[PDB]
Amino acid sequence: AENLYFQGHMVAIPGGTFRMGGEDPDAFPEDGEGPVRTVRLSPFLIDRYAVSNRQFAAFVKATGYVTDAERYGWSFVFHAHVDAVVPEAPWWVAVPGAYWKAPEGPGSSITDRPNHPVVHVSWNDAVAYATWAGKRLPTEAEWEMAARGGLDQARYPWGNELTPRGRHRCNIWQGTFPVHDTGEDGYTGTAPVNAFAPNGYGLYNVAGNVWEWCADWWSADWHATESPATRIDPRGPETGTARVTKGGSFLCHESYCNRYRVAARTCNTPDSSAAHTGFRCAADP
Ligand SMILES: [Ag+]
Ligand SMILES: [Ca+2]
Ligand SMILES: [Ca+2]
Q1: Which residues bind Ca(2+) 1?
Q2: H/E element holding 60?
Q3: Which ligand has the nearest atom to the CA of 247?
Q4: 257 assigned binding-site residue
């Protein structure tokens, strides 16, 4: 497609059909990456850039908005970035005072990261921002069609090679997780929202950098059946306990979590927040 066009921070995608999901050998099959399924979408707009600290700051200045992490008093921080740990993921520490303005908790700031994605934003925070911006969150199908950038069943936004020609195309982890990030892709942490090359629809950092909240309630099997509801502008199940997140983050590494593949998916309760999770907005024409 090329009746696509740019407007503001966004790209208008004139609707289309794509093969969603994946059945690759290195998938998490239990996540419901499969089955591969053909999905048709109505026209939509989606941010080509995740929402930045500067943008979130303007929202808070204009509204006085208080994030869930501020209300709870703590958010999840990666251990090496300065029991209170997640037993199943002990590199995550519950840090009092970690929030969007202090991403590693006390002693950190965003003064030198104005163009990085805002983090420690919950699904509720994302929705609040998007609504103020006159936007919404993307559905998982909109997110993934946009992230695929016009390629059919590629592993990544740009193709099937993680580092085509040996060049980094996204901000994830290199080295030995979780003890040593070599920063080969340039960043031991988040990167500016316009880092690396855009994909075929102009989107930056759909793979890597930060996880991105989607609109959908999480299910591993709702989309398995073939129906208009699951294949034409699919919205996901009517209820659920966690909301979908897509794209992976600067902590992803193939030794344990390869979910920067565009077919991959996970979820978190909508009041949760963490140092590696942000969002980008969508809209309708
Ligand atoms: Ag991952
Ligand atoms: Ca990195
Ligand atoms: Ca991402």
Answers
A1: 171-172, 185, 187
A2: helix 53-63
A3: 3
A4: yes
Q: How far apart (Å, rounded) are the C-alpha atoms in residues 171 and 157? A: 13
Q: Annotation-wise, does 240 bind a ligand?
A: no
Distance of CA 147 from the midpoint of ligand 1 (Å)? 16
Please state, in angstroms and rounded to a whole number, the distance separating the CA atoms of residues 119 and 151: 29
Q: What is the resolution of this structure in A?
A: 1.7
Question: Is 89:63 a contact under the CB 8 Å cutoff?
Answer: no
Bond preceding residue 35 cis, omega within 30 of 0 = yes
Q: In the beta sheet, which residues pair with residue 250? A: none
Distance CA 142, CA 14 (A): 12
Q: Which residue has the tokens 């920063």?
A: 183
Q: Which residues surround ligand 2, an ion (CB under 5 A)?
A: 171, 185, 187, 250
Determined by which method?
X-ray
- Is 5 annotated in some ligand binding site? no
Q: Give CA 213 to chain center in angstroms.
A: 6
User: Which domains are present in the chain?
Assistant: 1-285 (3.90.1580.10)
Measured from the alpha carbon of residue 266, the closest ligand is: 1
